Amino acid sequence: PKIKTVRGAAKRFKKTGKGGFKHKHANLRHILTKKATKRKRHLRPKAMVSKGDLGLVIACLPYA
Amino acid sequence: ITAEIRLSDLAKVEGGVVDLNTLKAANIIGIQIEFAKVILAGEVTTPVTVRGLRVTKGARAAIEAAGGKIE
Amino acid sequence: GIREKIKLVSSAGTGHFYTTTKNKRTKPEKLELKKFDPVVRQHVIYKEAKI
Amino acid sequence: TRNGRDSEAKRLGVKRFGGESVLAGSIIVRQRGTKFHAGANVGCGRDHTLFAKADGKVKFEVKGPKNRKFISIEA
RNA sequence: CUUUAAUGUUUGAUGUUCUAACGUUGACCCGUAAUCCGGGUUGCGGACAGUGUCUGGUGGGUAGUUUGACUGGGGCGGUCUCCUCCUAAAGAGUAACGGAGGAGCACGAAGGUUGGCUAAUCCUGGUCGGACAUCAGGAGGUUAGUGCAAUGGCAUAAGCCAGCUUGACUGCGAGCGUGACGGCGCGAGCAGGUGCGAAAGCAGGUCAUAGUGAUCCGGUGGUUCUGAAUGGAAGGGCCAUC
RNA sequence: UGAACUCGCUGUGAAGAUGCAGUGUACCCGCGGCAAGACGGAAAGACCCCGUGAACCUUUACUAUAGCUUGACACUGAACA
RNA sequence: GUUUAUUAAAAACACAGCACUGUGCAAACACGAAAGUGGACGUAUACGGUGUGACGCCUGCCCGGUGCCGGGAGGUUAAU
RNA sequence: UUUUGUAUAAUGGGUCAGCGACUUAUAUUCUGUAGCAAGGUUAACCGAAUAGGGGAGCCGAAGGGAAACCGAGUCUUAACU
RNA sequence: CCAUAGGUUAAUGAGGCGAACCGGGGGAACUGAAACAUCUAAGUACCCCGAGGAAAAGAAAUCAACCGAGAUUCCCCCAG
Numbered sequence: 135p136k137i138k139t140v141r142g143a144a145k146r147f148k149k150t151g152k153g154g155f156k157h158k159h160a161n162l163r164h165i166l167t168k169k170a171t172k173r174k175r176h177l178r179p180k181a182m183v184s185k186g187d188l189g190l191v192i193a194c195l196p197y198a
Numbered sequence: 199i200t201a202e203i204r205l206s207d208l209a210k211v212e213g214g215v216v217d218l219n220t221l222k223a224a225n226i227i228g229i230q231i232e233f234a235k236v237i238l239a240g241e242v243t244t245p246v247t248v249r250g251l252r253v254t255k256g257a258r259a260a261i262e263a264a265g266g267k268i269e
Numbered sequence: 270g271i272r273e274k275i276k277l278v279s280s281a282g283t284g285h286f287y288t289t290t291k292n293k294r295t296k297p298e299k300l301e302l303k304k305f306d307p308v309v310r311q312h313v314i315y316k317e318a319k320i
Numbered sequence: 321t322r323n324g325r326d327s328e329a330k331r332l333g334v335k336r337f338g339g340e341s342v343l344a345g346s347i348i349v350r351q352r353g354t355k356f357h358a359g360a361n362v363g364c365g366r367d368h369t370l371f372a373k374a375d376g377k378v379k380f381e382v383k384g385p386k387n388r389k390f391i392s393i394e395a
Numbered sequence: 396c397u398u399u400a401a402u403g404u405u406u407g408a409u410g411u412u413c414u415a416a417c418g419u420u421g422a423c424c425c426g427u428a429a430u431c432c433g434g435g436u437u438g439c440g441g442a443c444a445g446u447g448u449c450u451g452g453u454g455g456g457u458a459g460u461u462u463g464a465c466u467g468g469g470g471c472g473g474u475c476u477c478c479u480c481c482u483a484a485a486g487a488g489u490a491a492c493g494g495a496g497g498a499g500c501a502c503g504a505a506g507g508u509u510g511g512c513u514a515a516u517c518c519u520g521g522u523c524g525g526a527c528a529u530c531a532g533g534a535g536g537u538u539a540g541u542g543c544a545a546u547g548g549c550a551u552a553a554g555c556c557a558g559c560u561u562g563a564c565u566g567c568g569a570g571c572g573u574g575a576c577g578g579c580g581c582g583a584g585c586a587g588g589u590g591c592g593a594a595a596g597c598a599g600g601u602c603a604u605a606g607u608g609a610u611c612c613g614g615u616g617g618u619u620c621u622g623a624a625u626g627g628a629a630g631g632g633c634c635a636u637c
Numbered sequence: 638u639g640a641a642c643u644c645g646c647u648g649u650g651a652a653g654a655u656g657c658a659g660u661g662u663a664c665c666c667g668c669g670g671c672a673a674g675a676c677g678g679a680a681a682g683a684c685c686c687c688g689u690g691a692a693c694c695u696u697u698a699c700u701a702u703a704g705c706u707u708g709a710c711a712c713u714g715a716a717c718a
Numbered sequence: 719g720u721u722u723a724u725u726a727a728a729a730a731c732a733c734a735g736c737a738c739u740g741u742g743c744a745a746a747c748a749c750g751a752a753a754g755u756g757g758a759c760g761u762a763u764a765c766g767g768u769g770u771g772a773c774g775c776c777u778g779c780c781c782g783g784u785g786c787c788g789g790g791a792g793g794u795u796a797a798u
Numbered sequence: 799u800u801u802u803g804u805a806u807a808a809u810g811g812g813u814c815a816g817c818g819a820c821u822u823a824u825a826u827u828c829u830g831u832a833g834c835a836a837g838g839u840u841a842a843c844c845g846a847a848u849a850g851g852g853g854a855g856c857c858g859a860a861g862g863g864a865a866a867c868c869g870a871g872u873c874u875u876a877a878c879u
Numbered sequence: 880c881c882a883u884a885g886g887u888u889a890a891u892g893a894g895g896c897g898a899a900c901c902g903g904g905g906g907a908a909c910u911g912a913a914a915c916a917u918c919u920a921a922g923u924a925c926c927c928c929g930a931g932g933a934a935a936a937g938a939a940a941u942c943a944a945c946c947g948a949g950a951u952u953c954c955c956c957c958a959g
């Protein structure tokens with residue numbers, strides 16, 4: 135039988151052109167007033183997954 | 199249900215007519231794809247009149263430089 | 270505890286707002302700061318309001 | 321025991337030492353108070369972090385009435 | 396509108412009687428040689444009781460489970476995240492149930508900026524007034540102060556004082572530090588729009604370092620985004636936020 | 638019952654040696670006795686700890702639940718006050 | 719008298735007697751999806767449960783807590 | 799064998815003979831190797847047939863964006879050195 | 880009161896067994912979630928009823944997307 139994708143991971147990562155994955159930053163859901171604007175601005179755009187935790191992502195979603 | 203038609207695989211249908219049902223017979227895009235777009239992937243020779251299809255600004259220069267008139 | 274948090278809403282423009290903390294017991298009146306609305310792209314009287 | 325507590329360490333110190341070529345924006349000294357002070361082409365942020373404001377080589381100087389350490393950059 | 400009388404009009408808590416559902420482990424009769432069961436007469440209950448669905452309460456009667464780690468064996472006690480100093484061997488880092496302390500905030504002025512200022516503690520003289528309140532001069536010079544621990548720092552004052560104010564601004568961000576990662580932090584300059592100053596300038600909160608929690612789920616406002624035939628909508632998304 | 642050509646002592650040594658070092662002593666082999674040692678044999682310690690193991694048992698631990706108990710609708714009908 | 723057949727025979731269990739308690743007969747209660755059985759072909763001098771444990775002298779104060787029992791005005795309160 | 803460490807007086811084995819433990823199926827990424835190449839390639843099936851059809855598909859040659867949408871650009875943003 | 884329940888006799892089938900496969904009625908737990916209660920294992924094991932040579936399903940109150948498919952079933956894709 136075929137491999138099943140870890141769907142939760144499929145809803146948190148997207149495959150870029152090279153091979154790496156874009157993901158949304160943590161710490162931008164609630165408790166925002168105490169955080170500085172500079173943080174919240176820097177956390178807004180998407181970000182690339184680090185080379186340490188890339189193998190864990192590549193395993194859990196083998197399709198795309 | 200939208201495709202990205204390569205302009206390299208443009209003149210492989212029916213002379214110079216590429217509506218949708220004609221393009222579908224050439225096996226370039228899937229069956230359940232109503233909307234589709236011609237991007238600048240390089241290389242056209244023959245004149246192709248691209249009817250009923252969305253075309254890119256780079257491909258609009260190329261297709262017309264080859265000869266064919268869009269819409 | 271004690272110090273609650275408030276929603277500074279604009280007057281002239283869209284319902285864009287800021288959020289600050291406020292001590293309600295010591296200062297029972299309302300704020301009326303002049304902060305920047307980025308939808309209208311101009312400084313506007315931002316009035317205090319509840320969440 | 322009554323105690324058995326400590327904070328995480330802050331990694332404070334001279335990151336770029338004297339003579340080292342640094343790029344415009346490079347942090348030279350992370351510290352608490354102005355032990356070192358900002359000289360020529362060197363800034364001083366809210367955290368008292370001295371950083372390069374120009375591409376050049378770091379220079380440590382000891383000048384002033386109170387004999388303080390200053391950090392300059394010369395291209 | 397209040398406040399209330401007679402009649403029509405619309406329903407309800409109660410009950411009390413009724414018999415026809417229902418009950419009958421009252422009595423008899425028949426299938427019938429039978430204390431079963433059915434049927435039939437007949438009394439006594441009688442629309443209650445009982446039984447079905449829904450529903451609140453109760454429920455170790457019964458079932459499935461949970462009941463943390465560190466630990467100079469385990470238990471009891473103590474600790475678990477964040478900040479400061481030493482341990483830490485002159486960069487960074489560095490343990491122990493090693494040695495000492497703090498934090499889970501505070502503030503529309505305690506922020507901004509402009510313009511000023513200088514402290515402690517004594518000495519001597521002076522009404523009530525005395526060691527000490529307020530005044531004068533002299534002495535010392537940062538022992539002071541810094542919204543809170545400790546550290547490093549500050550007279551160019553970051554100290555204490557006033558005058559206007561809202562930069563505790565939106566979009567970014569060259570280039571660095573620090574983390575296994577999640578993350579965290581420092582940041583000149585650009586666009587837009589303010590404040591303060593006569594202008595150079597300074598301003599993306601507070602002298603810095605604690606004041607804090609991921610995801611999921613859901614709420615609240617916004618929105619050139621999506622909308623299961625089409626038009627809307629719901630519901631999602633994106634932005635702000637709880 | 639790993640194989641044995643299967644001594645004492647003092648030391649050493651995964652920390653109590655038939656087996657290592659140094660030393661001492663001892664012809665080869667039965668038979669009857671004794672049980673100090675072979676950390677002798679017998680049971681993957683039952684004490685203690687550990688496992689995000691098991692089982693039963695307790696309870697005002699969490700969750701349910703049979704049973705018991707309350708109303709609504711149903712089987713369920715006519716008067717009048 | 720009974721008890722751990724196979725390491726415990728006892729002070730343990732039972733016991734006659736004693737109290738509280740439920741039960742009005744289609745009894746309480748028990749076994750049982752139910753029909754139905756037992757209780758009992760018994761009917762409160764009976765039956766079930768709980769404790770205590772021949773016999774003699776006795777058995778004191780507390781109803782705040784947990785349970786039980788009664789009361790129904792008031793508050794809160796599900797389905798509908 | 800397990801260990802920081804075993805002649806260890808820690809584990810296991812009386813001996814011999816036989817048997818006894820990284821497998822199989824489909825998906826997937828990477829390395830080698832062979833085919834053909836901006837192409838490669840078929841699946842069930844139809845063939846009696848390891849031929850040959852059948853390209854339904856799949857994958858690649860284009861990505862950015864949450865998405866509409868635009869596309870050698872595009873996203874961000876009022877606009878980006 | 881007729882009648883019904885009954886009770887005889889007679890025709891006519893049924894009864895039981897059997898490896899798997901099929902449809903229905905009931906229906907676990909270990910296990911996984913590195914604990915565990917939603918969830919998983921799984922309508923799986925098992926129990927029961929009716930089958931037949933197959934059984935079930937079946938000729939649209941189907942699903943498409945302004946074009947159109949024209950019953951069910953089974954296999955390969957769409958698509959982890």
Ligand SMILES: [K+]
Binds near residue numbers: 792
């Ligand atoms: K009431």
Ligand SMILES: [Mg+2]
Binds near residue numbers: 162
């Ligand atoms: Mg959000």
Ligand SMILES: [Mg+2]
Binds near residue numbers: 169170173
């Ligand atoms: Mg911050």
Ligand SMILES: [Mg+2]
Binds near residue numbers: 170171172563
């Ligand atoms: Mg800010």
Ligand SMILES: [Mg+2]
Binds near residue numbers: 167169170171
């Ligand atoms: Mg802030």
Ligand SMILES: [Mg+2]
Binds near residue numbers: 197
């Ligand atoms: Mg795929």
Ligand SMILES: [Mg+2]
Binds near residue numbers: 225227228229
């Ligand atoms: Mg195709």
Ligand SMILES: [Mg+2]
């Ligand atoms: Mg394709």
Ligand SMILES: [Mg+2]
Binds near residue numbers: 239240
């Ligand atoms: Mg190309």
Ligand SMILES: [Mg+2]
Binds near residue numbers: 321
């Ligand atoms: Mg102690």
Ligand SMILES: [Mg+2]
Binds near residue numbers: 327329
């Ligand atoms: Mg430290």
Ligand SMILES: [Mg+2]
Binds near residue numbers: 326329
């Ligand atoms: Mg340390």
Ligand SMILES: [Mg+2]
């Ligand atoms: Mg070099």
Ligand SMILES: [Mg+2]
Binds near residue numbers: 364365366
């Ligand atoms: Mg700064």
Ligand SMILES: [Mg+2]
């Ligand atoms: Mg009747």
Ligand SMILES: [Mg+2]
Binds near residue numbers: 419
């Ligand atoms: Mg009767």
